[PDB]
Amino acid sequence: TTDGVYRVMTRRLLGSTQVGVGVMQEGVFHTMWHVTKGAALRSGEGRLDPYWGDVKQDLVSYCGPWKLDAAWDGLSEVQLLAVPPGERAKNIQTLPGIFKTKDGDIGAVALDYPAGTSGSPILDKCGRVIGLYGNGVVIKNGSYVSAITQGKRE
Amino acid sequence: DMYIERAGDITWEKDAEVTGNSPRLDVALDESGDFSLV
Numbered sequence: 001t002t003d004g005v006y007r008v009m010t011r012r013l014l015g016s017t018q019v020g021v022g023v024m025q026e027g028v029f030h031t032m033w034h035v036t037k038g039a040a041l042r043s044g045e046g047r048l049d050p051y052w053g054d055v056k057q058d059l060v061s062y063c064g065p066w067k068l069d070a071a072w073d074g075l076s077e078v079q080l081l082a083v084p085p086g087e088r089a090k091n092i093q094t095l096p097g098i099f100k101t102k103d104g105d106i107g108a109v110a111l112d113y114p115a116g117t118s119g120s121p122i123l124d125k126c127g128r129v130i131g132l133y134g135n136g137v138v139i140k141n142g143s144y145v146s147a148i149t150q151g152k153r154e
Numbered sequence: 155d156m157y158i159e160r161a162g163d164i165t166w167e168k169d170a171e172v173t174g175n176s177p178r179l180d181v182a183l184d185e186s187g188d189f190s191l192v
């Protein structure tokens with residue numbers, strides 16, 4: 001339960017398969033809903049139970065309420081701390097694009113990684129998590145663009 | 155049964171590899187959490 005970035009694994013399929021990634025901060029585990037579907041998780045010999053989740057936001061927290069509240073400033077480059085399946089954590093710097101919606105604009109990162117990279121954190125220059133990578137769209141040119149998905153800290 | 159494994163610290167890396175473009179897209183978000191192009 002040390003703060004940091006974690007892989008989310010399963011042994012249900014062939015061998016050990018990485019289905020996603022998440023962030024441990026202030027004793028709470030944060031990931032995207034589509035990675036765990038709200039199922040409980042194991043951390044060593046201990047169990048982490050879901051605490052909050054929302055399919056539409058595509059987010060879920062374990063052991064406590066969503067803690068991540070930093071926001072992209074709309075101007076600066078950010079870093080995707082990509083944790084790909086079977087590969088070392090790697091920082092990728094990029095200038096986000098925008099998703100324009102009827103309910104407001106959201107930052108978006110145009111980087112393509114395996115599905116099991118979902119839940120990797122996007123950071124600002126202070127190292128704060130401004131959202132999670134992995135819920136997005138496939139555009140005309142076939143490129144994948146992820147929203148910068150951030151929850152609300154109650 | 156799903157389990158977690160530590161992969162690293164969350165820090166900004168000075169002089170990290172810089173890539174990706176910045177597309178400005180009109181999108182819609184449905185009740186199932188799926189984004190689509192408008």
Ligand SMILES: N#CCC1=N[C@H]2CCCC[C@H]2N1
Pocket residue numbers: 112113114115116117118119133134135138144
């Ligand atoms: N996480 C993540 C990125 C990603 N997820 C798949 C979704 C469909 C397009 C191809 C893949 N790219």
